[PDB]
Scaffold this active site. Structure first.
Site, PDB file in Angstrom:
ATOM      1  N   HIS A  61      -3.301-151.435 -67.177  1.00  6.53           N
ATOM      2  CA  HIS A  61      -4.368-151.983 -66.393  1.00  6.53           C
ATOM      3  C   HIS A  61      -3.960-152.270 -64.913  1.00  6.53           C
ATOM      4  CE1 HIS A  61      -3.378-156.475 -66.657  1.00  6.53           C
ATOM      5  NE2 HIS A  61      -2.976-156.146 -67.941  1.00  6.53           N
ATOM      6  N   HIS A  91       1.475-158.761 -59.440  1.00  6.72           N
ATOM      7  CA  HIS A  91       0.643-157.584 -59.622  1.00  6.72           C
ATOM      8  C   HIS A  91      -0.459-157.599 -58.595  1.00  6.72           C
ATOM      9  CE1 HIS A  91      -1.404-160.698 -61.991  1.00  6.72           C
ATOM     10  NE2 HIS A  91      -2.476-160.131 -61.533  1.00  6.72           N
ATOM     11  N   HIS A  93      -4.757-156.307 -57.897  1.00  9.31           N
ATOM     12  CA  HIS A  93      -6.043-155.757 -58.292  1.00  9.31           C
ATOM     13  C   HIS A  93      -6.573-155.030 -57.090  1.00  9.31           C
ATOM     14  CE1 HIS A  93      -6.183-158.603 -61.790  1.00  9.31           C
ATOM     15  NE2 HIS A  93      -5.411-159.306 -60.999  1.00  9.31           N
ATOM     16  N   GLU A 103     -10.569-159.799 -56.491  1.00  9.01           N
ATOM     17  CA  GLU A 103     -11.230-160.586 -57.566  1.00  9.01           C
ATOM     18  C   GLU A 103     -11.924-161.775 -56.966  1.00  9.01           C
ATOM     19  OE1 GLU A 103      -8.264-161.074 -60.666  1.00  9.01           O
ATOM     20  OE2 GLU A 103      -9.392-159.583 -61.830  1.00  9.01           O
ATOM     21  N   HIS A 116      -1.397-161.109 -56.782  1.00  7.92           N
ATOM     22  CA  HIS A 116      -1.230-162.272 -57.623  1.00  7.92           C
ATOM     23  C   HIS A 116       0.236-162.473 -57.970  1.00  7.92           C
ATOM     24  CE1 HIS A 116      -5.597-161.954 -59.039  1.00  7.92           C
ATOM     25  NE2 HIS A 116      -5.464-162.461 -57.815  1.00  7.92           N
ATOM     26  N   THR A 195      -7.661-163.313 -65.715  1.00  8.81           N
ATOM     27  CA  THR A 195      -8.834-162.503 -65.461  1.00  8.81           C
ATOM     28  C   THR A 195      -8.876-161.233 -66.238  1.00  8.81           C
ATOM     29  OG1 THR A 195      -7.987-161.235 -63.652  1.00  8.81           O
ATOM     30  CG2 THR A 195      -8.986-163.416 -63.105  1.00  8.81           C
ATOM     31  N   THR A 196      -8.009-161.104 -67.234  1.00  7.57           N
ATOM     32  CA  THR A 196      -8.106-160.090 -68.268  1.00  7.57           C
ATOM     33  C   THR A 196      -8.054-160.789 -69.590  1.00  7.57           C
ATOM     34  OG1 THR A 196      -5.673-159.650 -68.567  1.00  7.57           O
ATOM     35  CG2 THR A 196      -6.868-158.375 -66.917  1.00  7.57           C
TER      36      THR A 196
HETATM   37  O1  MNP Z   1      -5.111-162.594 -64.579  1.00  4.50           O
HETATM   38  C1  MNP Z   1      -4.709-161.372 -64.526  1.00  4.50           C
HETATM   39  O2  MNP Z   1      -4.455-160.588 -63.561  1.00  4.50           O
HETATM   40  C2  MNP Z   1      -4.518-160.781 -65.873  1.00  4.50           C
HETATM   41  C3  MNP Z   1      -3.218-161.189 -66.531  1.00  4.50           C
HETATM   42  C4  MNP Z   1      -3.011-160.800 -67.805  1.00  4.50           C
HETATM   43  C5  MNP Z   1      -1.880-161.074 -68.509  1.00  4.50           C
HETATM   44  C6  MNP Z   1      -0.888-161.768 -67.909  1.00  4.50           C
HETATM   45  C7  MNP Z   1      -1.094-162.059 -66.608  1.00  4.50           C
HETATM   46  N1  MNP Z   1      -0.176-162.784 -66.090  1.00  4.50           N
HETATM   47  O3  MNP Z   1      -0.797-163.571 -65.337  1.00  4.50           O
HETATM   48  O4  MNP Z   1       1.203-162.609 -66.531  1.00  4.50           O
HETATM   49  C8  MNP Z   1      -2.192-161.828 -65.865  1.00  4.50           C
HETATM   50 NI    NI Z   2      -4.364-161.017 -61.545  1.00  3.64          NI
END
Ligand code: MNP
Ligand code: NI
Ligand code: NI
Length: 257
Positions: A61, A91, A93, A103, A116, A195-196
């Site tokens: 994802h 990560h 988005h 987001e 994030h 958010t997933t």
């Molecule tokens: O909120 C998100 O981008 C999804 C998400 C999903 C699973 C773990 C995550 N993390 O914050 O380690 C983030």
């Molecule tokens: Ni995120």
């Protein structure tokens, strides 16, 4: 078998995770005029000097840049936070187009992407336990706009061809996440969620007001990634953002006037 499409996207997730319609879901639109300046807020401390990046993974994802979180090496404290939060991964988005991808939104404005930096509260001992708590995580959110290149992002961009498909990883040592931060640490904060799926309501969100600039070419490389595994039909990894959710009974606080 969830995702971002018509048939399995955000608007379906509630059937597996009823918490999707909960009281503190993320992201939200940040109404800048209605966020209230909070003088109780303690100043934000980002301590990333000892960070140890390890690996980059395409998880189907997004991609995650993972850190050694077995010691207090890269920590977030202060702001709205009580206690010490350790960096585990970052990560992004992003969109199919420059006009969407973030987001959070700011007065309904969508940025091209959002970074994030995910941290867990050390009082809970590990990430898995922390996600079960209302104050388990702190996510530092940074908007990306398209303009000048971000030099500190290029190392990430260049390795993405090695992790094109779901489940691929590559060694990613010696990456300094300080090179992804804007000048100012002014922020908005509110209580929210992942958010997933599984959409856990465990996050204190800290969204920086100042975006970073990345080049068109940098974001283009994000859009070459694939949701699919190798040997499956190609589906470009784009539009991996959940849209804004209802604020419900929350207040967004500002660290600045
Ligand atoms: O909120 C998100 O981008 C999804 C998400 C999903 C699973 C773990 C995550 N993390 O914050 O380690 C983030
Ligand atoms: Ni995120
Ligand atoms: Ni599934």
């Amino acid at each position: 078998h969830w995702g971002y499409g018509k048939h399995n996207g955000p608007e379906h997730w509630h059937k597996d995770f009823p918490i999707a319609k909960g009281e503190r879901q993320s992201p939200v639109d940040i109404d800048t005029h209605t966020a209230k300046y909070d003088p109780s807020l303690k100043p934000l401390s980002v301590s990333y000097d000892q960070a140890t990046s390890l690996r980059i993974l395409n998880n189907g994802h997004a991609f995650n840049v993972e850190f050694d979180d077995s010691q207090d090496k890269a920590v977030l404290k202060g702001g709205p936070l009580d206690g010490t939060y350790r960096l585990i991964q970052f990560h992004f988005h992003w969109g199919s187009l420059d006009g969407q991808g973030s987001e959070h939104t700011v007065d309904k404005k969508k940025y091209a992407a959002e970074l994030h930096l995910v941290h867990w509260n050390t009082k809970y001992g590990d990430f898995g336990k922390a996600v079960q708590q209302p104050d388990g995580l702190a996510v530092l959110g940074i908007f990306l706009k398209v303009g000048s290149a971000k030099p500190g992002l290029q190392k990430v961009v260049d390795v993405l061809d090695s992790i094109k498909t779901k489940g691929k990883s590559a060694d990613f040592t010696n990456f300094d996440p300080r090179g992804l931060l804007p000048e100012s640490l002014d922020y908005w904060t509110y209580p929210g969620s992942l958010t997933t799926p599984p959409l856990l309501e465990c996050v204190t969100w800290i969204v920086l007001k100042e975006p970073i600039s990345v080049s068109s070419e940098q974001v283009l490389k994000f859009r070459k990634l694939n949701f699919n595994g190798e040997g499956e039909p190609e589906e470009l990894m784009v539009d991996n953002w959940r849209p804004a959710q209802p604020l419900k009974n929350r207040q967004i606080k500002a660290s600045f006037k």
